[PDB]
Amino acid sequence: KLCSLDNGDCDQFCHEEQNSVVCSCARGYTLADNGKACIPTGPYPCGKQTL
């Protein structure tokens, strides 16, 4: 199922390559050490409500 299985466990973008999941992030985020989570690089990252 890969990316079709719960987004491949990715926080954001999921791509399938060589029958493996590859995660990536929107501009302004960096992929975390686990290769799945997306970490904001600076203040007021895109797509986050300001609460």
Add this chain to the structure above:
Amino acid sequence: IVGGQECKDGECPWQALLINEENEGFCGGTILSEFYILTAAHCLYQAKRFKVRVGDRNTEQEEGGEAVHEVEVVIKHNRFTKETYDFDIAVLRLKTPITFRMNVAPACLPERDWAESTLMTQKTGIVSGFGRTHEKGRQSTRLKMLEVPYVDRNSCKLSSSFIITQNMFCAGYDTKQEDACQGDSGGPHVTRFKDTYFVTGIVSWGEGCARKGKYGIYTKVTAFLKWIDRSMK
């Protein structure tokens, strides 16, 4: 926005409002970045000279977050025509950068394949704006948001008196009195995924507002991601 509810503090920070010389909003937009606003191409024909306001939730009261920005460049899609409303998309570059803060922040642009596979197959997206609260009513002084179901593409084409092009998609309700409306045009349709909001549409057109058997029609942003990227350079 017909139905729905108010955007509460911080909830719709990517909303922009296009305002005319009279300081009246006539269309919405979406903050993409400090310099760029996404809006509808057809909105550009509805005012001579306009500016962009961000950080506003109540047009009758100064909340402390409001900022007005002048437009430096208008980038309208060269394939837009008023007869079809196809390619209903434009990008605005601002003269000065938006300073993000409470109630002022960009929505994320998704990647195409993932957005179409994963975001546009979600149950709902969210539309927002200062537009009319019913088809015959006046514009809202309060920024509103509305959860709108993605609508089956076949069902929509069958429902529509006008051609639904590959650059449009439909969202909303068959009979439930909730929908975007005039004044919301050009504004955000976003989809939430794991607490992050991605731009998925532009409020484009609809036969009236919240009419039985009619849906809201949105510009399919995922079809224009390369075009948007180029325009922001």
